[PDB]
Amino acid sequence: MEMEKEFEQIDKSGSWAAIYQDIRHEASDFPSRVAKLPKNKNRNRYRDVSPFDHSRIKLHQEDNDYINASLIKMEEAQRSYILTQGPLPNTVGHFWEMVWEQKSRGVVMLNRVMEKGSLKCAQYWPQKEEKEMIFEDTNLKLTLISEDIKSYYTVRQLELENLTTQETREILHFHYTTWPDFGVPESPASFLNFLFKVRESGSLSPEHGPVVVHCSAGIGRSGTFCLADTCLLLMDKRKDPSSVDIKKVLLEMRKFRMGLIQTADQLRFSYLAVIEGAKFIMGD
Numbered sequence: 001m002e003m004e005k006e007f008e009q010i011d012k013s014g015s016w017a018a019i020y021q022d023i024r025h026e027a028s029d030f031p032s033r034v035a036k037l038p039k040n041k042n043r044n045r046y047r048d049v050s051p052f053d054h055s056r057i058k059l060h061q062e063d064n065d066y067i068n069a070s071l072i073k074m075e076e077a078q079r080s081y082i083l084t085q086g087p088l089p090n091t092v093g094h095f096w097e098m099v100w101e102q103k104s105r106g107v108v109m110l111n112r113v114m115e116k117g118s119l120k121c122a123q124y125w126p127q128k129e130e131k132e133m134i135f136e137d138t139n140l141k142l143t144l145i146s147e148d149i150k151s152y153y154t155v156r157q158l159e160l161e162n163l164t165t166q167e168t169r170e171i172l173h174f175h176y177t178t179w180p181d182f183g184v185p186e187s188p189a190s191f192l193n194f195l196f197k198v199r200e201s202g203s204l205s206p207e208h209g210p211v212v213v214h215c216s217a218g219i220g221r222s223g224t225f226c227l228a229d230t231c232l233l234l235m236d237k238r239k240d241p242s243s244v245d246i247k248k249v250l251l252e253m254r255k256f257r258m259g260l261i262q263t264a265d266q267l268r269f270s271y272l273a274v275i276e277g278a279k280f281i282m283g284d
């Protein structure tokens with residue numbers, strides 16, 4: 001069923017809450033035993049958001065390999081994503097260790113450091129060229145190279161150095177700065193513009209490690225970004241664009257991380273973004 005007609009049918013019937021609860025009921029439940037070990041309590045931002053054991057990213061160290069991060073792998077679309085929480089004061093070094101070890105080119109940030117008057121993640125990148133950051137626990141150095149501030153997002157060029165080997169890499173930081181403190185954006189135009197800028201950079205392409213995507217918990221806004229990207233790529237690759245079922249794609253993604261799409265409003269916004277984005281994919 002063409003999703004645009006499914007959309008108008010749910011909107012006229014006002015059944016978004018009902019569709020959303022159906023997804024919550026059918027979603028996968030896998031063990032998260034490593035996340036719940038007492039040694040890992042200060043590595044989790046939220047007690048109720050954990051990576052499944054089967055899909056968690058492992059740090060390359062014998063001490064403690066744990067980070068709150070999941071690998072979402074899609075075969076047909078040919079895309080992989082790492083979804084993670086906003087880093088904590090004691091996990092900023094683990095965060096950059098993961099980017100290094102997984103060979104990521106891009107970091108996608110969908111939150112502000114402060115929202116609703118509370119801290120939603122650590123200040124984990126340098127704000128001035130001449131004031132670099134050193135992460136002594138993981139032996140990494142991070143330098144701000146350049147910053148491009150636009151109305152709806154900022155793009156930063158960062159240099160990450162492995163102090164152990166003196167290898168360096170360029171990391172691109174894509175920061176969506178205008179998601180509202182409450183609800184979802186009224187139009188998906190600025191979110192789709194941002195998605196297309198990440199795509200254009202090479203950050204989502206198979207010659208690199210998976211993109212790292214985060215918000216505060218790494219399930220809500222983060223879920224919306226990967227769901228929209230994958231659905232638009234499937235509409236491109238297939239003979240029948242209309243064959244794409246956004247609810248079935250979301251359930252596939254929830255096999256790899258719990259809780260993706262946190263509200264019925266986030267589900268409606270994801271539909272809007274895919275419907276409006278398809279009017280480019282199909283030749284405009």
Ligand SMILES: CO[C@H]1CN(CCO)S(=O)(=O)c2ccccc21
Binds near residue numbers: 075
């Ligand atoms: C029917 O489900 C298919 C197609 N997908 C939905 C698009 O209609 S999927 O790409 O999310 C996917 C992912 C893993 C396994 C199977 C599937």
